[PDB]
Symmetry: C3
Subunit: 95 residues, 3 copies
Amino acid sequence: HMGTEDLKYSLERLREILERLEENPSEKQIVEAIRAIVENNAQIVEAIRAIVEILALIVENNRAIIEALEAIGGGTKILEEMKKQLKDLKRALER
Amino acid sequence: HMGTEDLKYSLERLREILERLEENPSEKQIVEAIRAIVENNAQIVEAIRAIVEILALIVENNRAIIEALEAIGGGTKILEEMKKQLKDLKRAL
Amino acid sequence: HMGTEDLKYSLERLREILERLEENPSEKQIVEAIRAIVENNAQIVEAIRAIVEILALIVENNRAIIEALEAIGGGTKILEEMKKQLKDLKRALER
């Protein structure tokens, strides 16, 4: 559940409120548009959090993949490179 | 990065618009600032959806990698882990 | 991680500003909300840039992985698919 549907929904409601604001500006409509922006930003944060969670799972999957390759046995150099890349991916996500 | 430069540009434009709004908060300038915010957020939604598509492509690539490892290395404990991880990834996307 | 905590808090600050905006939708409160929206967006852009970079690193890691598989098992039909997938991923990251 990446939540892209509700992210899109929140953008469309914001667009509708913007059109009404453009046609008949007022304090009421400015507040309504800012409230819609906040709701759209809320869905953006949720989508970003869900993405970051998937990234962590992918990196864990690659960790297991690289362990399988080590077990099979292979070139020293390529294994060292893959491990270093994995190390940097872990660091990036832990930052 | 992919479209990051466009997002960076749109952000700098918002900062410029904000500075003009701060010294001239007219109704018209407020509406134009809000217009720019929406246009920027539309770009963000687009970039997020593009990221999600790449995540699906990565996960399909890892599915193939794990199949390749099964054919070469056989049935291992580590193979069991990879399949479980992959199943969760496919379910979560 | 990856700034998600800062994004969540930034959203909370926006909501609090919106509460006071609804209380008195003066120009000062409107500009305060818009200034906070821009600051929040700056963090969103930064989070998306960090995400895109991790994506490229993961593709780089998968490229090394497939390099290792070819060195271990030689040419295979699954290797053909994986290299076409990599190229498509590399193309997606440019566009």
